[PDB]
Design a protein around this ligand. Structure first.
Ligand SMILES: Nc1ncnc2c1ncn2[C@@H]1O[C@H](CO)[C@@H](O)[C@H]1O
Ligand SMILES: Nc1ncnc2c1ncn2[C@@H]1O[C@H](CO)[C@@H](O)[C@H]1O
Lengths: 240, 238
C-alpha cells in the first residue's frame, strides 16, 4: 500500500525529513521493508529501506515506472478563494482525487482579496496525491487577477466561464463546448459572482458562458462540479 | 435574500430561536422587514417581522408557493459511512447543494459499524438547504443492511453498484444505464469495497456494475461524484 513523496529521488537516496519521520517513527518500518515512492513528476519508484538513523531514512531504488495519468488533456480550475480557508482546502484535496492539472486562485471585482499562501496549498495537493496514488500534483497559482487569466490562458484551450446570479444579464453547458482532445479551463466566480464587465471581457477573449446545473452551489462546490463535468464527459462520450 | 427555516410556520408565527437570534441580534433586522421562509417540506413563504421580544420573534405570513425541485426523478445515494464522521458531514452538505432526495448509510461486510450522528447531519442538511435556496432536505437513513437496499429498492429504478478494487473485478459507466425519466439509486461501498458475494447478490437483483471513473476516490468523494454524474446526465439531455 502507502505511497511517499521523494522529489529528489533521482539524485539522492535520503528521503525528505517529513516522510522519514512518518516511516520510521509513526509507521515503525525497518531496514529491508519495501516502499513505493513518487517524485511528483509522473514516476513511481520501487525502493527498499537501506538505513534508518535517529533522524533520517535512506533507501535504495530497485525500479521505476511512468504513471499513466487517468484522464485526457489538461484541466485547469481558476476560481475565487472562499472566505473560510477550510472550504477551498477541502475542495483542493477533492480536485486532486478526481484529477486536475492546475488550480488558479484568482482575484475578481467581488472576490476576497487576502494574500493566499501557496505553500500550504502545495502540501495539501501533495498529500492528496499520495492518498489517491497519483504520481503528480497540480500547478497551484495564487492571487492571479481575473484579467490575466482571461488574456493569457493559452487560446487552444476551451475556456469556459461559469456564472449564476439572476442580475448578471444565454448560457448552455460544458458539454456544448468541451471536446476530448483539447485542454480546458473553467473560470468560477466569488459568492457575489463575476461582474457583467468581467463576463463581457471573458466572452470577447473567446470564453464560452456556461451553467454548471440548476442548483445554487457554494464556490468550492462549483470548483468540484466543474472538474467532474469534464471527467464525466470524457467517460460518457467514449466511442466504441 | 437569505432563506430561514421555520418548520412550524403553518401552526405558529413564532420563529425558531436559532433563526430569531440570527435575524434580530446578528442581522439586526426589525419589525416591518421582509423575510423568506421555508418549512423544509417543499414550500417557500413570504413573511414580515411583526414583533420582537426579549425572547421571541413573531412574523406574519403574506404568501406561500410550492418549490420547483431543480432536478428530475429521485436520486438516492446509499453509502458506507467513513470511520470519521467529519467526512460524512462535508459530503452531506455538498450532496444537498448538488441535489439529492435520499441518503442512506448502509451496513455491509467491510463497513464501519458505528452510530451515525444523525441530528448533526440533519442540521447540516438544513444549512445547505438554506444556502442553496431549496425548500426541502433529503431523507437521511442510518444503519440500513446492504441486503435490504439490494432486495427492496424498486425494480423500476435504475440501480447501480459502484465498485473499483482489483480482487472484486465488466463495468459500464452510469451513462450506460441511466436515462432521464427513471429514479436512480447508487450503492457505494466502504474503503474495503463490497465483497464478491455482495456484488453477486446485487447483480442477481438487477443492479448494474459501474465505474465512476479511473481515479481512486475516497468514499465521501465517490458519493459526490456519483450524484453529480446523475445531474450531468440530466443537463446533457435538457
Ligand atoms: N449552477 C451554477 N451554474 C453556473 N455557475 C455556477 C453554478 N453554481 C455556482 N456557480 C459558480 O459558483 C460561483 C459562486 O456561487 C459563481 O460565481 C459561479 O461561477
Ligand atoms: N472508480 C470507481 N468506480 C466505482 N466505484 C468507485 C470508484 N472509486 C470509488 N468507488 C466507490 O467508493 C467506494 C470506496 O472506494 C467503493 O466501494 C466504490 O463503491
Amino acid at each position: 500500500l502507502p505511497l511517499f513523496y521523494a522529489p529528489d529521488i533521482e539524485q539522492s537516496d535520503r528521503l525528505p525529513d517529513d516522510e522519514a519521520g512518518h516511516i520510521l517513527r509513526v509507521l515503525r518500518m525497518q531496514a529491508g521493508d519495501r516502499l513505493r515512492l513518487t517524485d511528483g513528476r509522473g514516476s513511481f519508484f520501487d525502493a527498499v529501506i537501506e538505513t534508518a538513523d535517529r533522524k533520517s531514512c535512506y533507501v535504495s531504488v530497485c525500479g521505476q515506472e511512468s504513471w499513466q495519468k487517468p484522464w485526457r488533456d489538461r484541466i485547469t480550475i481558476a476560481i475565487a478563494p472562499t472566505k473560510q480557508s477550510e472550504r477551498m482546502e477541502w475542495m483542493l484535496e477533492k480536485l486532486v482525487e478526481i484529477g486536475v492539472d492546475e488550480v488558479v486562485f484568482i482575484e475578481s471585482e467581488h472576490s476576497e482579496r487576502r494574500r493566499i499562501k501557496a505553500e500550504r496549498l502545495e502540501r495539501i495537493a501533495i498529500s492528496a496525491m499520495k492518498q489517491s496514488l497519483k504520481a503528480s500534483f497540480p500547478v497551484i497559482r495564487v492571487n492571479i487577477p481575473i484579467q490575466t487569466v482571461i488574456a493569457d490562458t493559452p487560446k487552444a484551450a476551451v475556456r469556459l466561464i461559469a456564472y449564476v446570479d439572476e442580475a448578471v444579464r444565454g448560457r448552455g453547458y460544458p458539454s456544448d463546448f468541451y471536446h476530448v482532445g483539447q485542454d480546458v479551463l473553467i473560470l468560477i466566480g466569488p459568492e457575489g459572482d463575476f461582474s457583467p464587465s468581467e463576463v463581457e471581457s471573458a466572452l470577447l477573449a473567446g470564453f464560452a458562458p456556461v451553467s454548471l446545473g440548476e442548483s445554487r452551489l457554494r464556490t468550492e462546490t462549483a470548483g468540484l462540479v466543474a472538474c467532474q463535468w469534464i471527467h464525466t464527459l470524457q467517460a460518457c462520450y467514449r466511442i466504441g
